[PDB]
Design a protein around this motif. Structure first.
Motif, PDB file in Angstrom:
ATOM      1  N   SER A  52       0.858  -1.213   0.000  1.00  0.00           N
ATOM      2  CA  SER A  52       0.000   0.000   0.000  1.00  0.00           C
ATOM      3  C   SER A  52       0.883   1.249   0.000  1.00  0.00           C
ATOM      4  O   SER A  52       0.519   2.229  -0.676  1.00  0.00           O
ATOM      5  N   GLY A  53       1.996   1.214   0.740  1.00  0.00           N
ATOM      6  CA  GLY A  53       2.893   2.382   0.829  1.00  0.00           C
ATOM      7  C   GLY A  53       3.261   2.918  -0.541  1.00  0.00           C
ATOM      8  O   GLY A  53       3.507   4.133  -0.652  1.00  0.00           O
ATOM      9  N   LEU A  54       3.284   2.048  -1.554  1.00  0.00           N
ATOM     10  CA  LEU A  54       3.658   2.467  -2.932  1.00  0.00           C
ATOM     11  C   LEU A  54       2.653   3.510  -3.431  1.00  0.00           C
ATOM     12  O   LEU A  54       2.993   4.246  -4.375  1.00  0.00           O
ATOM     13  N   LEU A  55       1.461   3.556  -2.830  1.00  0.00           N
ATOM     14  CA  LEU A  55       0.433   4.559  -3.216  1.00  0.00           C
ATOM     15  C   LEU A  55       0.329   5.621  -2.119  1.00  0.00           C
ATOM     16  O   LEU A  55       0.259   6.815  -2.461  1.00  0.00           O
ATOM     17  N   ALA A  67       0.535  11.048  -0.838  1.00  0.00           N
ATOM     18  CA  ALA A  67       0.418  11.896   0.370  1.00  0.00           C
ATOM     19  C   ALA A  67       1.510  12.969   0.343  1.00  0.00           C
ATOM     20  O   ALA A  67       1.198  14.137   0.646  1.00  0.00           O
ATOM     21  N   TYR A  68       2.736  12.585  -0.018  1.00  0.00           N
ATOM     22  CA  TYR A  68       3.866  13.551  -0.034  1.00  0.00           C
ATOM     23  C   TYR A  68       3.554  14.687  -1.011  1.00  0.00           C
ATOM     24  O   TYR A  68       3.712  15.862  -0.632  1.00  0.00           O
ATOM     25  N   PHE A  69       3.120  14.343  -2.227  1.00  0.00           N
ATOM     26  CA  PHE A  69       2.823  15.376  -3.252  1.00  0.00           C
ATOM     27  C   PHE A  69       1.654  16.240  -2.774  1.00  0.00           C
ATOM     28  O   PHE A  69       1.727  17.476  -2.908  1.00  0.00           O
ATOM     29  N   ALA A  70       0.612  15.605  -2.232  1.00  0.00           N
ATOM     30  CA  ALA A  70      -0.578  16.351  -1.761  1.00  0.00           C
ATOM     31  C   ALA A  70      -0.156  17.362  -0.693  1.00  0.00           C
ATOM     32  O   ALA A  70      -0.329  18.573  -0.925  1.00  0.00           O
ATOM     33  N   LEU A  71       0.380  16.879   0.430  1.00  0.00           N
ATOM     34  CA  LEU A  71       0.755  17.786   1.546  1.00  0.00           C
ATOM     35  C   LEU A  71       1.820  18.770   1.052  1.00  0.00           C
ATOM     36  O   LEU A  71       1.702  19.972   1.363  1.00  0.00           O
ATOM     37  N   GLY A  72       2.808  18.277   0.303  1.00  0.00           N
ATOM     38  CA  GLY A  72       3.864  19.157  -0.233  1.00  0.00           C
ATOM     39  C   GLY A  72       3.271  20.255  -1.094  1.00  0.00           C
ATOM     40  O   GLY A  72       3.660  21.425  -0.909  1.00  0.00           O
ATOM     41  N   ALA A  83      -6.713  12.365  -2.259  1.00  0.00           N
ATOM     42  CA  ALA A  83      -7.823  11.387  -2.301  1.00  0.00           C
ATOM     43  C   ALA A  83      -7.250   9.972  -2.409  1.00  0.00           C
ATOM     44  O   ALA A  83      -7.672   9.102  -1.625  1.00  0.00           O
ATOM     45  N   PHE A  84      -6.316   9.762  -3.341  1.00  0.00           N
ATOM     46  CA  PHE A  84      -5.691   8.423  -3.507  1.00  0.00           C
ATOM     47  C   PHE A  84      -4.849   8.113  -2.267  1.00  0.00           C
ATOM     48  O   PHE A  84      -4.776   6.933  -1.875  1.00  0.00           O
ATOM     49  N   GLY A  85      -4.242   9.139  -1.669  1.00  0.00           N
ATOM     50  CA  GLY A  85      -3.486   8.928  -0.420  1.00  0.00           C
ATOM     51  C   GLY A  85      -4.375   8.307   0.640  1.00  0.00           C
ATOM     52  O   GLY A  85      -3.947   7.321   1.267  1.00  0.00           O
ATOM     53  N   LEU A  86      -5.581   8.857   0.825  1.00  0.00           N
ATOM     54  CA  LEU A  86      -6.526   8.321   1.839  1.00  0.00           C
ATOM     55  C   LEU A  86      -6.835   6.859   1.505  1.00  0.00           C
ATOM     56  O   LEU A  86      -6.855   6.032   2.436  1.00  0.00           O
ATOM     57  N   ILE A  87      -7.055   6.559   0.222  1.00  0.00           N
ATOM     58  CA  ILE A  87      -7.309   5.150  -0.198  1.00  0.00           C
ATOM     59  C   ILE A  87      -6.105   4.305   0.221  1.00  0.00           C
ATOM     60  O   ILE A  87      -6.315   3.256   0.857  1.00  0.00           O
ATOM     61  N   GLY A  88      -4.894   4.764  -0.102  1.00  0.00           N
ATOM     62  CA  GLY A  88      -3.669   4.029   0.270  1.00  0.00           C
ATOM     63  C   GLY A  88      -3.561   3.859   1.774  1.00  0.00           C
ATOM     64  O   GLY A  88      -3.137   2.774   2.215  1.00  0.00           O
ATOM     65  N   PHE A  89      -3.934   4.892   2.534  1.00  0.00           N
ATOM     66  CA  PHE A  89      -3.852   4.827   4.017  1.00  0.00           C
ATOM     67  C   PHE A  89      -4.785   3.727   4.529  1.00  0.00           C
ATOM     68  O   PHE A  89      -4.352   2.917   5.370  1.00  0.00           O
ATOM     69  N   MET A  90      -6.027   3.708   4.040  1.00  0.00           N
ATOM     70  CA  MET A  90      -7.004   2.675   4.471  1.00  0.00           C
ATOM     71  C   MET A  90      -6.471   1.299   4.064  1.00  0.00           C
ATOM     72  O   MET A  90      -6.588   0.358   4.873  1.00  0.00           O
ATOM     73  N   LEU A  91      -5.897   1.195   2.862  1.00  0.00           N
ATOM     74  CA  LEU A  91      -5.309  -0.090   2.400  1.00  0.00           C
ATOM     75  C   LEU A  91      -4.170  -0.479   3.347  1.00  0.00           C
ATOM     76  O   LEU A  91      -4.059  -1.677   3.670  1.00  0.00           O
TER      77      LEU A  91
END
Ligand code: CLA
Ligand code: CLA
Ligand code: CLA
Ligand code: CLA
Ligand SMILES: C=Cc1c(C)c2cc3nc(c4c5[nH]c(cc6nc(cc1[nH]2)C(C)=C6CC)c(C)c5C(=O)[C@@H]4C(=O)OC)[C@@H](CCC(=O)OC/C=C(\C)CCC[C@H](C)CCC[C@H](C)CCCC(C)C)[C@@H]3C
Ligand SMILES: CC(C)=CCC/C(C)=C/CC/C(C)=C/CC/C(C)=C/CC/C(C)=C/CC/C(C)=C/CC/C(C)=C/CC/C(C)=C/CC/C(C)=C/CC1=CC(=O)C(C)=C(C)C1=O
Ligand SMILES: CCCCCCCCCCCCCCCCCC(=O)OC[C@H](CO[C@@H]1O[C@H](CO)[C@H](O)[C@H](O)[C@H]1O)OC(=O)CCCCCCCCCCCCCCCCC
Ligand SMILES: CCCCCCCCCCCCCCCCCC(=O)OC[C@H](CO[C@@H]1O[C@H](CO)[C@H](O)[C@H](O)[C@H]1O)OC(=O)CCCCCCCCCCCCCCCCC
Ligand SMILES: CCCCCCCCCCCCCCCCCC(=O)OC[C@H](CO[C@@H]1O[C@H](CO)[C@H](O)[C@H](O)[C@H]1O)OC(=O)CCCCCCCCCCCCCCCCC
Ligand SMILES: CC1=C(/C=C/C(C)=C/C=C/C(C)=C/C=C/C=C(C)/C=C/C=C(C)/C=C/C2=C(C)CCCC2(C)C)C(C)(C)CCC1
Ligand SMILES: CC1=C(/C=C/C(C)=C/C=C/C(C)=C/C=C/C=C(C)/C=C/C=C(C)/C=C/C2=C(C)CCCC2(C)C)C(C)(C)CCC1
Ligand code: OEX
Ligand SMILES: [Cl-]
Ligand SMILES: [Cl-]
Lengths: 32, 35, 32, 480, 55, 29, 66, 36, 75, 31, 348, 30, 23, 63
Positions: free
Chosen positions: K29-32, K37-42, K115-123
């Motif tokens: 999951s970390g691959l997503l 997340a880095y790009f979003a928050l950054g 949005a995809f970060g949140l999906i990755g976090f739940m995964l």
């Protein structure tokens, strides 16, 4: 700006006083 | 003869929760239902 | 080819390269 | 003692009674299909197909039946408004009755499958224990699914055998169910390209059949089978829930944003149409053309079809509605009777003044009259102690061209302000709010209601996918 | 809430960003102020005989 | 607000209530 | 078991085999290719509808009905 | 490690952090965003 | 090595005794040079309003935005 | 020297130090 | 391997490496989660630091412009973009980073990657839980946050004109979004929001009461004032008395939990339920289907001028909020309201 | 009679709370 | 008289005709 | 992308609070905070400015 400059000088000396007492006491194995 | 045959189980607290919820939901939507 | 379509196709190649790079990275780290 | 939220888990390992329980759900759905349709037909008025369309009458299932072809009715009336010369067995009532009879048959079938749940078919031959080859079950079902998809698109939609699909002009002024021809081109992917439906269903259908053969022939990979718990019924349930919730979002967006599958003359106009002045620009366009031809303002506005003008009304906007504002669109604004005609607001200087239309996001919008330049020249001031744009001081007179008030001029401040308030809501139409005792508030169209309900179901089903999927992945931990 | 009960309102950054010549560059805070004005001019429609709402 | 509005509220406060009561009585039995 | 009905015997072979799996990833790689291809297809239709992927042919408007 | 009192390191670094935040508040009443 | 161990390694401090200062200086120079205004097209305090437009810019053309925003920015 | 832990530490710290320098300069810009 | 023994594949290699004890659990999951997340928050930081909405909202939203932490915000794209995904290569920016930022592209970048970060976090939650061999209740609970984000940052914006009417990534931006909903959607009157507020307030009550009760029913397992010292991480006996707690609340409140499991299940159910309820309400607002007002009282107030209720009073407030913010909040509408047309009360 | 309906709902909810406190299942469990 | 746009815009500033070709 | 260095430790452009304006045969120092207005309240309006917030504070030059 001389007043502001010497104001900052005062701030530095006063703020450094507390740590100065600790560092010295610690260095000479004081009762801290 | 289905061995899968089981029975539903409702306890006092579960009954209270259900009745409380159905009543609270009515109290909340009743105003909107009557608009 | 509409300029939009051309840019879209290019972005697809960029996405594949980005993904491919991740696969190469995990492949190398897993290899070592 | 299974908890209330785990009672239907009894058939999880009973394939024989699983069909029964599914047969029940299918029967209930079939019964509602015909029941709701019968109710709508009993409460539908086909007298006026212009100012009283189905969507205005709050019909929901009737649009769908009309979309695939059903137009006539044993009542001797067509959805077009003409007399149903020969409605035939497939009359609105007929199709409804059919669904009801189907429901009953499904109920009896469910009873038998429930009673005779122990069928050797479910048992596995190697062990004798009840086992279902989910891999193949999907393949056979997929193959059959593809057949229907291709047949519907290549026959019912194409028209070769099926009646056809509902197609209308861009302004939904004229449309009906006519056979369509598959686009088979880039245009085929245009959501407003009807031909795409036939082409897509034919293409998707043939592929589905081929895919079904693959799942039937090729067996699942050992790594994939275990990795995806292809031996668990809940596995297919979780993945299937993911598919239904995905489609629900796609179906909703298609209805909200509009498409060739969602006729505006069957589900009502889209909110974006008003936001972009789609119908309004057309009305003004043809008017200018008639004026360019040399016809008087009355002649041009008289040429405007009342149906086109009816579309240009904030009331028909689906977004203009309330969550608990239940009822048909006719209720809350009255049953449209006729068109008063175009209202022309002009100041004393003779400058033509345009009433700013109410933005959808605004429940109440201040009345403002602007010149062609876009400068406010008149308005109804909230404070009249020292106004500088008061309709009175500006001396604005409203003259109606075409419609009921054709050639009628109004200078009374109150009368002009009244029409100005209506003008901001779009074309001014007469409405009978007595028969239904309308409340005077706007309602949402069936289009908006469908989008809201399906989006809600989709969002909830997302939780269903996560829940059932988590149980399949953590079956060992959830085991108990 | 108790401090605001003594008229100690929250941060007020209305017209805080100004350009070189002095023109006011509006911000999200200014937009929030626009709404606050609407609620203010409406609250107690007939319960204000003077402009300032010192009360 | 109409008969339907009251009828809806009545059913919502009766159908579910009765169902729960039956389950509890069955389990209590 | 029991209740061996003729329809049951007819459909018996369909469910007779089960749990049969192919050793290794089997067609998993081929499946991955299809998933990527269909994903690209969905992106194209979405971009066209979103008007991001402007195409001369499609009109992406109610005028398309014309 | 050694020849370095971590307690002093923290006290110094912490003092610098307070100073940085002070500059931010200074900029709040000066130059851009000062309402003047 | 625990973060504390590294936060005590004077060598680690020497290693970051130059890199960290440079990273901050670069950030200061970035803005001072005015590169930030050009890189992100952020209007400088003297170019928010042009002689042509004395009001906030409103982009109205989606597919003609590139040229529109440039014109609004007065190039 | 470049482990995941090290990469993560410099993935945020290095950018932050630069950003902090930029913000400080912004605190001395005059309209 | 695989209850049959199979040849190891590159997947097995990558699997073990990703799923390997590491300072932080990378996993698959970390691959997503890590990149998006880095790009979003950054992107949010870069935007709030040096990016302007002068051409999207005509507002200064950057520390470089002189905004503070509260005012600075990544504003949404202009309403002209509508529901355009606005890629850097999109037909708008056409591969121009400067213009892409000026067109408000960063907002879409942060939202999409987040949005995809949140999906990755739940995964990640499911992945870690599966490795720990524990039911993924935490992941199921993270559905409520994701539902809120999708309904407020995706469904609503899509249901409206464009991304312009979506929550901008900023403290003040969120505040104006909240005020807008009250003035236009009357979000407070919406029953679904009411249930949502109940959940958040109820969950807070549960969190506080549970901590207080446990920390106040603790057994004396130590000989010092500091009770925290008197605890063993691998202790079996409960540190607090469930019995004592049960009697206290049974007499003080009249009812009290008797099953620790049910208590904690209730602690996680209340908050998740509330968030999902509010999400359904936001879905309605997206389509403008809102419980704005009760027609029954509206008709009575119109026919009977004297009749008045707090409900009617709130309606008037909403009318002011919309009229005294629309001009700027919605610049695309280009609405110039003469001061006389604006609704103003006596004096003020 | 909408007020009568509302009063009934409010009274009913309070009644449930009453039995939930005095006629609740004895807490044999801790 | 006024152009369709010179009429659609004052009536609806967000009309496609007024919101298009604006460059 | 003009390479204008930021006014770090620089001098304020204008603190007079008034921006000099020139029109057709008329000149005046408009308030800096006041923004241009597009409402022709009276006939012959040439210049029309209003305060950033309160529109009551407005200026009109009629010729
Ligand atoms: C076809 C879809 C489908 C199917 C077949 C199932 C099947 C099942 N689910 Mg389930 N679920 C689904 C969708 C589905 N679910 C979705 C979309 C969600 C997200 C909200 C959930 C969330 C969910 C949870 C949280 C749980 C289950 C559970 C269960 C199991 C127990 C069923 C039960 O409690 O008896 C039913 C007894 C009842 C009293 C419920 C009926 C009461 C309803 C509300 C009244 C009917 C309203 C209306 C007719 C519903 C249809 C609406 C439709 C027309 C749109 C069962 C095998 C339970 C489980 O343990 O999993 C194994 C469990 O706790 N599901
Ligand atoms: C899910 C796919 C689908 C759906 C929802 C419908 C729905 C409908 N079809 Mg249909 N049809 C389909 C597939 C489908 N069809 C396919 C694949 C074919 C090619 C074999 C046909 C050929 C067909 C014909 C020839 C006719 C319909 C007709 C109808 C309408 C009459 C009511 C009815 O129950 O149909 C009837 C059930 C059938 C199986 C159609 C046969 C009816 C006989 C042949 C007439 C109805 C709206 C009738 C109509 O008048 O349309 C308004 C009609 O004339 N369909
Ligand atoms: C020449 C053959 C041909 C032709 C002409 C077409 C033509 C068309 N196809 Mg198609 N298709 C074909 C072959 C063909 N297809 C084949 C062989 C397959 C494989 C079997 C498909 C599979 C396929 C699919 C799956 C879909 C289409 C769709 C479409 C239509 C595009 C409009 C659209 O995208 O819907 C509307 C816009 C979208 C679908 C984009 C949105 C997609 C998002 C991701 C869905 C949301 C999911 C997510 C859970 C939502 C989260 C919440 C949200 C608020 C963010 C169009 C008319 C679409 C359709 O059916 O229209 C309804 C579509 O969904 N086709
Ligand atoms: C997604 C499915 C769906 C959709 C989109 C619609 C849409 C529509 N239906 Mg409908 N309907 C459906 C399913 C659906 N229906 C089903 C399954 C049935 C069988 C029961 C019906 C039976 C039905 C009838 C009898 C009628 C309609 C009507 C209508 C139209 C009027 C608007 C409306 O419904 O009122 C607004 C909807 C709401 C206000 C939703 C209510 C709010 C929810 C329920 C929250 C309540 C929560 C709370 C716990 C409820 C209990 C509170 C308590 C005090 C009572 C509309 C376009 C009317 C019509 O137009 O006639 C043709 C009409 O008379 N429908
Ligand atoms: C303001 C309220 C609020 C916030 C800020 C918040 C935040 C968070 N909740 C988390 C978790 C949870 N929250 C839960 C229940 C709840 N969460 C709630 C309310 C909140 N939860 C509520 C009410 C509940 C009870 C129902 C659960 C059950 C969990 C978790 O398991 C999880 C956790 O472990 O927490 C410690 C974390 C997961 C982060 C993540 O995805 O990592 C990766 C980071 C990503 C994907 C980046 C997201 C980017 C976002 C979506 C968009 C961009 C935002 C900008 C960068 C900044 C914008 C700033 C403006 C808005 C002002 C995160 C710290
Ligand atoms: C004339 C009249 C009657 C006038 C009144 C009119 C009026 C005011 C009407 C309003 C009615 C009303 C209530 C309206 C609200 C409607 C509404 C918003 C409904 C929401 C419904 C709903 C399902 C919402 C979704 C979110 C949700 C599920 C929230 C749940 C909130 C909730 C119940 C939380 C807990 C509340 C609470 C008080 C908990 C107590 C817990 C407790 C007993 C602790 C004791 C205890 C704690 C321990 O830690 C330990 C260790 C032990 C051992 C122990 O025991
Ligand atoms: C759960 C887990 C996953 C969570 C999130 C996953 C998110 C993925 C990213 C999705 C971003 C949005 C994609 C583009 C959608 C879009 O452009 O739509 C809008 C566009 C249409 O675009 C609109 O068209 C209108 C007229 O039809 C008007 O002209 C509008 O101005 C115009 O913007 O349609 C699409 O391209 C796809 C529509 C369907 C998309 C899926 C359903 C979305 C919700 C629909 C109902 C809303 C209410
Ligand atoms: C229990 C009560 C529920 C509400 C009852 C309303 C009764 C009523 O008066 O109006 C009932 C309304 C009809 O309302 C009536 O309509 C009449 C004409 O048909 C007249 O106009 C009447 O004046 C009008 O009151 O119809 C319904 O609402 C019944 C169907 C309910 C669902 C419809 C919309 C579905 C939308 C989403 C579904 C999914 C949601 C998922 C959410 C998460
Ligand atoms: C990772 C951190 C993400 C938040 C960064 C906040 C930030 O950089 O603020 C940066 C802002 C910048 O502060 C602004 O700077 C401008 C520069 O032109 C002007 O000088 C403004 O007057 C000034 O308010 O800091 C402040 O808000 C001032 C108080 C300090 C607040 C620090 C909060 C840090 C945590 C959040
Ligand atoms: C037996 C038999 C018979 C008869 C049959 C029948 C009669 C059928 C029908 C049936 C039916 C008659 C069915 C239906 C039912 C109903 C339904 C199925 C519906 C339900 C509803 C719902 C589910 C909804 C819900 C909701 C609400 C209301 C609120 C909002 C939301 C919603 C909408 C969701 C015959 C003759 C054939 C013969 C043989 C035998
Ligand atoms: C978008 C995009 C991208 C990305 C980017 C990024 C990711 C960036 C990052 C950035 C960053 C990473 C930034 C950082 C930031 C941070 C900061 C800026 C800091 C802050 C802090 C402060 C301000 C502080 C304050 C105070 C306190 C409170 C505490 C202590 C200290 C003091 C006291 C001072 C890419 C490439 C994909 C491409 C495309 C686009
Ligand atoms: O009372 Mn309650 O409220 Ca606080 O402000 Mn002054 O006084 Mn009235 O006014 Mn606005
Ligand atoms: Cl008030
Ligand atoms: Cl006063």
């Amino acid at each position: 700006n001389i007043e502001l400059a010497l104001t900052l000088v005062s701030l530095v000396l006063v703020v450094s006083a507390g740590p100065l007492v600790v560092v010295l006491l610690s260095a000479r194995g004081g009762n801290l | 003869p289905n061995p899968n045959k089981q029975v539903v189980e409702l306890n006092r607290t579960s009954l209270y929760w259900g009745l409380l919820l159905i009543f609270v939901l009515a109290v909340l939507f009743s105003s909107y239902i009557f608009n | 080819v509409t300029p939009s379509l051309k840019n879209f196709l290019g972005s697809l190649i960029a996405g594949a390269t980005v993904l491919g790079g991740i696969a190469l990275a995990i492949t190398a780290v897993s290899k070592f | 003692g299974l908890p209330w939220y785990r009672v239907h888990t009894v058939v999880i390992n009973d394939p024989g009674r699983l069909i029964s329980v599914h047969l029940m759900h299918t029967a209930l759905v079939s019964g509602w299909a015909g029941s709701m349709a019968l109710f709508e037909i009993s409460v539908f008025d086909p007298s006026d197909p212009v100012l009283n369309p189905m969507w205005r009458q709050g019909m929901f299932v009737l649009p769908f039946m009309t979309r695939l072809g059903i137009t006539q009715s044993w009542g001797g009336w067509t959805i077009s408004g003409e007399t149903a010369t020969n409605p035939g067995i497939w009359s609105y009532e007929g199709v409804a009755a059919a669904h009801i009879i189907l429901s009953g048959a499904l109920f009896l079938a469910s009873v038998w499958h429930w009673t005779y749940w122990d069928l050797e078919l479910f048992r596995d031959p190697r062990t004798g224990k009840t086992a279902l080859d989910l891999p193949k079950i999907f393949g056979i079902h997929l193959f059959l699914s593809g057949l229907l998809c291709f047949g519907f698109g290549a026959f019912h939609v194409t028209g070769v055998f099926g009646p056809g699909i509902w197609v209308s002009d861009p302004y939904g002024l004229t449309g009906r169910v006519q056979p369509v021809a598959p686009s088979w081109g880039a245009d085929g992917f245009d959501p407003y390209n009807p031909g795409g439906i036939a082409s897509h269903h034919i293409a998707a259908g043939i592929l589905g059949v081929l895919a079904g053969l693959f799942h039937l022939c090729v067996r699942p990979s050992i790594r994939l089978y275990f990795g995806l718990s292809m031996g668990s019924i809940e596995t297919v349930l979780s993945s299937s829930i993911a598919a239904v919730f995905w489609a629900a979002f796609v179906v909703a967006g298609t209805m909200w944003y509009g498409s060739a599958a969602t006729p505006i003359e069957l589900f009502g106009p889209t909110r974006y149409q008003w936001d972009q002045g789609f119908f309004q620009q057309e009305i003004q366009k043809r008017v200018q053309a008639s004026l360019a031809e040399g016809a008087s303002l009355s002649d041009a506005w008289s040429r405007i079809p009342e149906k086109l003008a009816f579309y240009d009304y904030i009331g028909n906007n689906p977004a203009k509605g309330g969550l608990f504002r239940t009822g048909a669109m006719n209720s809350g604004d009255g049953i449209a009777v006729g068109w008063l005609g175009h209202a022309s607001f002009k100041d004393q200087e003779g400058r033509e003044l345009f009433v700013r239309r109410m933005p959808t996001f605004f429940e109440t919008f201040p009345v403002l009259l602007l010149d062609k330049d876009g400068i406010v020249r008149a308005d109804v001031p909230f404070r009249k102690a020292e106004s500088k744009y008061s309709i009175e001081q500006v001396g604005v007179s409203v003259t109606f061209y075409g419609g009921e008030l054709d050639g009628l001029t109004f200078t009374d401040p109150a009368t002009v302000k009244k029409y100005a308030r209506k003008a901001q809501l779009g074309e001014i139409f007469e409405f009978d709010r007595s028969t239904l005792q309308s409340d005077g508030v706007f309602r949402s169209s069936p289009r908006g209601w469908f989008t809201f309900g399906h989006v809600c179901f989709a969002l909830l089903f997302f939780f269903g996918h996560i829940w059932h999927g988590a149980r399949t992945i953590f079956r060992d931990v959830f085991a108990g | 809430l108790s401090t605001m009960a003594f008229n100690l309102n929250g941060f007020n950054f209305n017209q805080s960003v100004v350009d070189s010549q002095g023109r006011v560059l509006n911000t999200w805070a200014d937009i929030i102020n626009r709404a606050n004005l609407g609620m203010e001019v409406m609250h107690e429609r007939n319960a204000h005989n003077f402009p300032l709402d010192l009360a | 607000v109409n008969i339907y509005g009251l009828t809806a509220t009545a059913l919502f406060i009766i159908i579910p209530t009765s169902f729960l009561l039956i389950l509890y009585v069955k389990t209590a039995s | 078991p029991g209740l061996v009905t003729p329809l049951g015997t007819l459909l018996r072979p369909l469910n007779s085999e089960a749990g049969k799996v192919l050793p290794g990833w089997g067609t998993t790689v081929l499946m991955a290719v299809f998933i990527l291809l269909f994903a690209a297809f969905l992106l194209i239709i979405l971009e066209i509808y979103n008007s991001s992927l402007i195409l001369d042919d499609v009109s992406m408007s109610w005028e398309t009905l014309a | 490690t050694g020849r370095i009192p971590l307690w002093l390191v923290g006290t110094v670094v912490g003092t610098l952090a307070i100073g940085l935040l002070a500059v931010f508040f200074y900029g709040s009443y000066v130059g851009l965003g000062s309402s003047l | 090595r625990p973060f504390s161990d590294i936060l005590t390694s004077i060598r680690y401090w020497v290693i970051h005794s130059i890199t960290v200062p440079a990273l901050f200086i670069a950030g200061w120079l970035f803005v001072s040079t005015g590169l930030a205004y050009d890189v992100f097209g952020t209007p400088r305090p003297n170019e928010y309003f042009t002689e042509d437009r004395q009001e906030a810019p409103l982009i109205t053309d989606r597919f003609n935005a590139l040229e529109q925003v440039k014109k609004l920015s007065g190039n | 020297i470049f482990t995941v832990r090290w990469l993560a530490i410099h993935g945020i710290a290095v950018p932050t130090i630069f950003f902090l320098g930029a913000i400080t300069a912004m605190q001395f810009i005059q309209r | 391997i695989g209850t049959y023994q199979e040849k190891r594949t590159w997947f097995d290699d990558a699997d073990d490496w990703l799923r390997q004890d590491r300072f932080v659990f990378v996993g698959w999951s970390g691959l997503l989660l890590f990149p998006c997340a880095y790009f979003a928050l950054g992107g949010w930081l870069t935007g709030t630091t040096f990016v302007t909405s002068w051409y999207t909202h005509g507002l200064a939203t950057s520390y470089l412009e002189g905004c503070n932490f509260l005012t600075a915000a990544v504003s949404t794209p202009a309403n002209s973009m509508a529901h355009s995904l606005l890629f850097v290569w999109g037909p708008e920016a056409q591969g121009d980073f400067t213009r892409w930022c000026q067109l408000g592209g960063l907002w879409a970048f942060v939202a999409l990657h987040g949005a995809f970060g949140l999906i990755g976090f739940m995964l990640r939650q499911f992945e870690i839980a599966r490795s720990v061999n524990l039911r993924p209740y935490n992941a199921i609970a993270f559905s409520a946050p994701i539902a809120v984000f999708v309904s407020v940052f995706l469904i609503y914006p899509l249901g409206q004109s464009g991304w312009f009417f979506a929550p901008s990534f900023g403290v003040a931006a969120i505040f104006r979004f909240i005020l807008f909903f009250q003035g236009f959607h009357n979000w407070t009157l919406n029953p679904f929001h009411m249930m949502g507020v109940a959940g958040v307030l109820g969950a807070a009550l549960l969190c506080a009461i549970h901590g207080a009760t446990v920390e106040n029913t603790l057994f004396e397992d130590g000989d010092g004032a500091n009770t925290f010292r008197a605890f063993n991480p691998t202790q079996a006996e409960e540190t607090y008395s469930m019995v004592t707690a049960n009697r206290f609340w049974s007499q003080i409140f009249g009812v009290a939990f008797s099953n620790k499991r049910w208590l904690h299940f209730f602690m996680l159910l209340v908050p998740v339920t509330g968030l999902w309820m509010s999400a359904i309400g936001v879905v309605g607002l997206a389509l403008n289907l809102r419980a704005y007002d009760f027609v029954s009282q509206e008709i009575r107030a119109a026919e009977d001028p004297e009749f008045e209720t707090f409900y009617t009073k709130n309606i008037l407030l909403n009318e002011g909020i919309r009229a005294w913010m629309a001009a700027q909040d919605q610049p695309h509408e280009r609405l110039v309201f003469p001061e006389e047309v604006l609704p103003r009360g006596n004096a003020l | 009679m909408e007020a009568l309906v509302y009063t009934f709902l409010l009274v009913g909810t309070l009644g449930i709370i009453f039995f939930s406190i005095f006629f609740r299942d004895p807490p044999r469990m801790i | 008289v006024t152009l369709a746009l010179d009429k659609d815009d004052p009536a609806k500033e967000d009309s496609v005709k007024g919101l298009r070709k604006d460059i | 992308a003009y390479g204008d260095s930021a006014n770090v430790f620089g001098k304020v452009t204008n603190k007079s609070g008034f921006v000099p304006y020139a029109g057709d045969g008329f000149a005046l120092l408009l308030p800096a905070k006041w923004n241009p207005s597009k409402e022709n309240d009276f006939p012959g309006v040439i210049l029309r400015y209003e305060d950033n917030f309160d529109a009551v504070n407005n200026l009109v030059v009629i010729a």
